[PDB]
């Protein structure tokens, strides 16, 4: 758009190309996203407009929504790096626990805020968790999923990851709750600790079975109503639950306790962001400065 000079491509997002750009009338650098063909439905417009209001220090700020020439462009606050690259860059020694705790703690704050407003992300992943040079981490593209039906394969033909998708979704539950974000965050939490994705599925069934292999195949005992779900199949293999001390060493007892609650099968039993913030694991949280090299 006229008022923006693209400086470079930051990547291919789920909803279109993302460009780092500079606003010509303010001089601020931002993250510009182009979305999508009918002319953009009113519904999408109102949902997005609502997002312009839910502001929080741990939520990437939506600066402007430009609907011109029947095209949708979203302008977001710009952050220099995502957790994905940061992790890859910290593969040798891993992200220090104090920093891991700080990041998880802030993410939960952002989630508690959005959830209190009944707004969920639905697609959390390292790629949309942005960090700055001041020890902060923020949630990006919050709420866009409900605004636009999330596709299986991006416009760039890139395969969208299922690694962080909650089991209720894999099983066909059509009414996701805020619990899906807690699950995603728990998977990411585990990944930061072990430096390896928790459930690297490459298909829905592979994703589902990897979950079943680590946490045990769910039944009516641990998850009432599981067998009545759309994609549940009595013929699912019956695996035993691995013990967490084996799944996320060397995370301490508090972390493992908290991770276990963020990973409960039953969405209703899964800990909320709010309750999570009061968990003993955060007893000694601090805000360390990351070693970022831009
Ligand atoms: C793909 C991309 N996804 C996000 C979330 C990107 C980004 C990069 C920099 N700043 C912002 N807000 N967003 S680029």
Coordinates of C-alpha atoms in Angstrom, one line a residue, residues 29-249:
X29 CA 8.8 -0.2 11.0
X30 CA 6.1 -2.8 11.1
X31 CA 5.1 -6.3 10.1
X32 CA 2.6 -6.1 7.2
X33 CA 0.5 -9.1 6.3
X34 CA -1.5 -9.6 3.1
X35 CA -4.6 -11.8 3.4
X36 CA -5.9 -13.6 0.3
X37 CA -11.5 -14.3 -3.4
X38 CA -15.0 -12.7 -2.8
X39 CA -14.0 -9.3 -1.4
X40 CA -13.6 -10.2 2.3
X41 CA -16.9 -10.9 4.2
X42 CA -18.2 -8.4 6.7
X43 CA -17.9 -11.0 9.5
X44 CA -14.2 -11.2 9.0
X45 CA -14.0 -7.4 9.1
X46 CA -15.8 -7.1 12.5
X47 CA -13.8 -10.0 14.1
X48 CA -10.6 -8.3 13.1
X49 CA -11.8 -4.9 14.3
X50 CA -12.4 -6.4 17.7
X51 CA -8.8 -7.6 17.8
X52 CA -7.7 -4.0 17.4
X53 CA -8.9 -3.5 21.0
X54 CA -7.5 -6.4 22.9
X55 CA -4.1 -4.9 23.7
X56 CA -1.6 -6.5 26.1
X57 CA 2.2 -6.3 26.6
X58 CA 2.5 -9.9 25.6
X59 CA 0.2 -9.8 22.6
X60 CA 1.7 -8.4 19.4
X61 CA -0.1 -5.2 18.8
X62 CA -2.4 -4.9 15.8
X63 CA -1.6 -1.4 14.6
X64 CA -4.0 -1.0 11.7
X65 CA -6.4 -2.8 9.4
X66 CA -6.4 -1.6 5.9
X67 CA -9.3 -2.8 3.7
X68 CA -8.6 -1.2 0.3
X69 CA -9.4 -2.2 -3.3
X70 CA -11.3 -5.2 -1.8
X71 CA -8.0 -6.5 -0.3
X72 CA -7.1 -7.1 3.4
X73 CA -3.8 -6.0 4.9
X74 CA -3.0 -6.2 8.6
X75 CA -0.3 -4.1 10.1
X76 CA 1.4 -5.4 13.2
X77 CA 4.0 -4.2 15.7
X78 CA 7.3 -5.6 14.5
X79 CA 9.6 -7.9 16.6
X80 CA 13.1 -9.0 15.5
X81 CA 12.8 -12.7 16.0
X82 CA 10.6 -15.7 16.7
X83 CA 11.1 -18.5 19.2
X84 CA 11.7 -21.0 16.4
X85 CA 14.9 -19.3 15.2
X86 CA 15.9 -18.5 18.7
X87 CA 15.6 -22.2 19.7
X88 CA 17.6 -23.3 16.7
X89 CA 20.2 -20.8 17.7
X90 CA 20.3 -22.1 21.2
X91 CA 20.4 -25.8 20.3
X92 CA 24.0 -26.3 21.6
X93 CA 23.3 -25.5 25.3
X94 CA 19.6 -24.9 25.1
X95 CA 17.6 -21.9 26.4
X96 CA 18.5 -21.4 30.1
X97 CA 15.7 -22.6 32.4
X98 CA 15.3 -19.1 34.0
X99 CA 14.6 -17.7 30.5
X100 CA 12.3 -20.6 29.7
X101 CA 10.3 -19.9 32.8
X102 CA 10.2 -16.2 32.0
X103 CA 8.9 -16.9 28.5
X104 CA 6.3 -19.4 29.7
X105 CA 5.2 -17.1 32.4
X106 CA 4.6 -14.2 30.0
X107 CA 2.9 -16.4 27.4
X108 CA 0.5 -17.5 30.1
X109 CA -0.2 -13.9 31.0
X110 CA -1.0 -13.1 27.4
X111 CA -3.2 -16.1 27.2
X112 CA -5.0 -15.3 30.4
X113 CA -5.9 -11.9 29.0
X114 CA -7.2 -13.1 25.7
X115 CA -9.0 -16.0 27.2
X116 CA -10.7 -13.7 29.8
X117 CA -12.1 -11.9 26.7
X118 CA -13.2 -15.2 25.2
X119 CA -10.7 -14.9 22.4
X120 CA -8.4 -17.9 21.5
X121 CA -5.5 -18.3 19.2
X122 CA -6.1 -21.9 18.1
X123 CA -2.7 -22.1 16.3
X124 CA 0.1 -21.4 18.7
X125 CA 3.6 -22.4 17.6
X126 CA 7.2 -21.3 17.9
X127 CA 6.8 -19.4 14.6
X128 CA 4.2 -16.9 16.0
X129 CA 5.9 -16.4 19.4
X130 CA 8.0 -13.2 18.9
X131 CA 10.8 -11.9 21.2
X132 CA 12.6 -8.7 21.5
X133 CA 16.0 -7.6 23.0
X134 CA 14.4 -6.8 26.4
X135 CA 13.5 -10.3 27.6
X136 CA 9.9 -10.1 26.4
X137 CA 8.0 -12.6 24.3
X138 CA 4.7 -12.0 22.6
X139 CA 1.8 -13.9 20.9
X140 CA 1.4 -13.0 17.2
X141 CA -1.6 -13.5 14.9
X142 CA -4.0 -13.9 17.9
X143 CA -7.6 -14.4 16.8
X144 CA -7.0 -14.6 13.1
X145 CA -8.0 -18.3 13.0
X146 CA -11.6 -17.6 13.9
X147 CA -11.6 -14.7 11.5
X148 CA -10.4 -16.9 8.7
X149 CA -10.9 -20.7 8.4
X150 CA -7.4 -22.1 8.9
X151 CA -6.3 -24.1 5.8
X152 CA -4.4 -27.4 5.7
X153 CA -1.9 -26.1 3.2
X154 CA -0.8 -22.5 2.9
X155 CA -1.1 -20.4 -0.3
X156 CA 2.6 -21.1 -0.7
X157 CA 1.7 -24.8 -0.7
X158 CA 3.6 -25.1 2.6
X159 CA 2.2 -27.8 5.0
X160 CA 0.8 -26.3 8.2
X161 CA 2.2 -27.9 11.3
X162 CA 0.1 -30.2 13.5
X163 CA 2.7 -30.6 16.1
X164 CA 0.9 -28.3 18.6
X165 CA -2.7 -29.3 17.8
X166 CA -4.8 -30.4 20.8
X167 CA -6.3 -33.9 20.8
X168 CA -9.9 -32.6 21.0
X169 CA -9.3 -31.0 17.6
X170 CA -7.6 -34.1 16.0
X171 CA -10.6 -36.1 17.2
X172 CA -13.1 -33.9 15.4
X173 CA -14.5 -31.7 18.3
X174 CA -15.9 -28.7 16.3
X175 CA -16.1 -26.4 19.3
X176 CA -12.6 -25.6 20.6
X177 CA -12.2 -23.9 24.0
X178 CA -9.4 -21.9 25.4
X179 CA -7.9 -25.2 26.4
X180 CA -6.5 -25.8 23.0
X181 CA -4.0 -22.9 23.6
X182 CA -2.9 -24.4 26.9
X183 CA -2.1 -27.6 25.2
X184 CA -0.2 -25.9 22.4
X185 CA 1.8 -23.9 25.0
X186 CA 2.6 -27.1 27.0
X187 CA 4.0 -28.7 23.8
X188 CA 6.1 -25.6 23.2
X189 CA 7.2 -25.6 26.9
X190 CA 8.4 -29.2 26.5
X191 CA 10.2 -28.4 23.3
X192 CA 12.2 -25.5 24.9
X193 CA 13.3 -27.9 27.7
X194 CA 14.3 -30.9 25.7
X195 CA 15.3 -28.9 22.6
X196 CA 13.2 -31.3 20.5
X197 CA 9.6 -31.1 19.4
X198 CA 7.3 -33.2 21.7
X199 CA 4.9 -34.6 19.0
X200 CA 6.4 -34.1 15.5
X201 CA 3.4 -35.6 13.6
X202 CA 3.4 -35.5 9.8
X203 CA -0.3 -36.4 9.4
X204 CA -3.3 -36.3 11.7
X205 CA -3.2 -39.9 12.5
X206 CA 0.6 -39.8 13.0
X207 CA 0.1 -36.8 15.2
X208 CA -2.7 -38.5 17.2
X209 CA -0.7 -41.7 17.6
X210 CA 2.4 -39.9 18.7
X211 CA 0.3 -38.3 21.4
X212 CA -1.2 -41.7 22.4
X213 CA 2.3 -43.2 22.6
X214 CA 3.6 -40.7 25.1
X215 CA 0.5 -40.0 27.2
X216 CA -1.2 -43.4 26.7
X217 CA -4.3 -44.0 24.6
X218 CA -7.2 -42.0 26.2
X219 CA -10.2 -43.9 27.5
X220 CA -13.5 -43.0 29.3
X221 CA -11.7 -43.1 32.7
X222 CA -9.3 -40.2 32.0
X223 CA -11.5 -38.5 29.3
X224 CA -15.3 -38.9 29.6
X225 CA -16.9 -38.8 26.2
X226 CA -13.7 -39.5 24.3
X227 CA -15.1 -42.6 22.6
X228 CA -18.1 -40.6 21.4
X229 CA -16.0 -38.1 19.5
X230 CA -16.4 -37.8 15.7
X231 CA -13.0 -39.3 14.7
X232 CA -12.5 -41.6 17.7
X233 CA -12.2 -45.2 16.5
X234 CA -12.7 -48.2 18.9
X235 CA -9.9 -49.7 16.8
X236 CA -7.3 -47.2 18.1
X237 CA -4.2 -49.1 19.3
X238 CA -4.0 -49.2 23.1
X239 CA -0.7 -47.7 24.3
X240 CA 0.5 -47.2 27.9
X241 CA 1.4 -43.8 29.3
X242 CA 5.1 -43.1 29.5
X243 CA 6.3 -41.4 32.7
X244 CA 7.1 -37.7 32.4
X245 CA 10.5 -38.1 34.1
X246 CA 11.3 -39.9 30.8
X247 CA 9.5 -37.4 28.6
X248 CA 11.1 -34.1 29.7
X249 CA 14.3 -34.5 31.6

